[PDB]
Amino acid sequence: SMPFPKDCSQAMLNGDTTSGLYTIYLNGDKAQALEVFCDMTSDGGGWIVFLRRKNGRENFYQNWKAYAAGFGDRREEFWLGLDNLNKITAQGQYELRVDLRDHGETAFAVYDKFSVGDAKTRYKLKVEGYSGTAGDSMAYHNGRSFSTFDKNCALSYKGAFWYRNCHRVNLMGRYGDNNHSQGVNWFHWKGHEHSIQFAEMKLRPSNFRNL
Numbered sequence: 057s058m059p060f061p062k063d064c065s066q067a068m069l070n071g072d073t074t075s076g077l078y079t080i081y082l083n084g085d086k087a088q089a090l091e092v093f094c095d096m097t098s099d100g101g102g103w104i105v106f107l108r109r110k111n112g113r114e115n116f117y118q119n120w121k122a123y124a125a126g127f128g129d130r131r132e133e134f135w136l137g138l139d140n141l142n143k144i145t146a147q148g149q150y151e152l153r154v155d156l157r158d159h160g161e162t163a164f165a166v167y168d169k170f171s172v173g174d175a176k177t178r179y180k181l182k183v184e185g186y187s188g189t190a191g192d193s194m195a196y197h198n199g200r201s202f203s204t205f206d207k208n209c210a211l212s213y214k215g216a217f218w219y220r221n222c223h224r225v226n227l228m229g230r231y232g233d234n235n236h237s238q239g240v241n242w243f244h245w246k247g248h249e250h251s252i253q254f255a256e257m258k259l260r261p262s263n264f265r266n267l
């Protein structure tokens with residue numbers, strides 16, 4: 057086992073094969089402990105989950121400080137935090153996976169390169185290298201800064217995202233809201249008038265597939 061695993065891929069190779077809560081350590085530093093939810097089953101496991109939508113119990117219409125810090129219940133609906141995502145994605149080359157499920161139908165998207173810049177970049181999104189079945193709805197968002205109502209698409213759609221003008225992905229939108237562009241949308245799968253029941257966004261090293 058590694059003493060201070062820096063992501064859920066290092067925590068998994070530590071033999072731990074059950075999805076659930078694990079401690080990771082940013083940059084392998086014992087003074088930068090972070091509790092994460094690890095999806096250890098989807099496409100080989102080792103994924104830090106950073107967004108989960110599943111039931112509408114948690115409020116995603118939150119401010120900049122909340123999106124920077126994270127909020128919610130790791131075991132249920134939550135957001136890991138943009139500062140966490142910046143620090144994790146700075147550790148190496150990470151890949152993004154999005155898992156979607158709605159009335160029994162599933163789809164996914166993988167982006168071979170995924171990074172989130174630091175606060176001085178307003179947490180700029182990089183997503184490149186699409187594969188999957190959900191349709192490439194993040195391409196529209198590539199290179200965009202993060203937006204909350206207090207730093208306007210976030211206001212207009214009562215969500216938060218790497219908005220442009222405004223979105224093809226709105227996974228921090230209003231739960232069960234099928235009104236145009238208001239809900240948990242992935243446009244190139246289910247359009248703007250269908251709020252998706254279940255969504256996860258997760259990350260792991262891109263080289264995990266052959267390490």
Ligand SMILES: CN1CCN(c2ccc(C#N)cc2)CC1
Nearest residue numbers: 125126127128129130134135136
């Ligand atoms: C006021 N606090 C409430 C709980 N918060 C978090 C942070 C990250 C995750 C994850 N993963 C879940 C909850 C941090 C801020």
